[PDB]
Design a protein around this ligand. Structure first.
Ligand code: NA
Ligand SMILES: [Rh+]
Ligand SMILES: [Rh+]
Ligand SMILES: [Rh+]
Length: 129
């Protein structure tokens, strides 16, 4: 599923991301835009052999089992394929563990480089929430 901006914002708010660990909804929407272009099916291979999965490009190195990432952890206790569903519940629940883990949203390279210290409120302007 390729989400609309306001469609995703509404889904993220419902799934408990608005101000999660102090990160406004616009932060999560901006991260999703630059990570996946709002596409639940997005996959990208990392140079280390790990793969990033879904709307927030969660990494098989630490967070999910994809059957092909040797000596990696599965800290969200899920198959990485669960992160590609048109239902974002598994991505949201895993993102909550990631962002709680001490580095906050700096875990997302696209967030640090493209969203951090920007006017992220612009990502939710116009949306019915
Ligand atoms: Na893994
Ligand atoms: Rh939902
Ligand atoms: Rh600003
Ligand atoms: Rh509302």
């Amino acid at each position: 599923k390729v989400f609309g901006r306001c469609e995703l914002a509404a889904a993220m708010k419902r799934h408990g991301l608005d101000n999660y660990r102090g990160y406004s909804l616009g932060n999560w929407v901006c991260a999703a835009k630059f990570e996946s272009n709002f596409n639940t099916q997005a996959t990208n291979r990392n140079t280390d052999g790990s793969t990033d999965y879904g709307i927030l490009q969660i990494n098989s190195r630490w967070w999910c089992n994809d059957g092909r990432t040797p000596g990696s952890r599965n800290l969200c206790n899920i198959p990485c394929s669960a992160l590609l569903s048109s239902d974002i519940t598994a991505s949201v629940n895993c993102a909550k563990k990631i962002v709680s883990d001490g580095n906050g949203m700096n875990a997302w390279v696209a967030w640090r480089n493209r969203c951090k210290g920007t006017d992220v409120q612009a990502w939710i302007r116009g949306c019915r929430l």
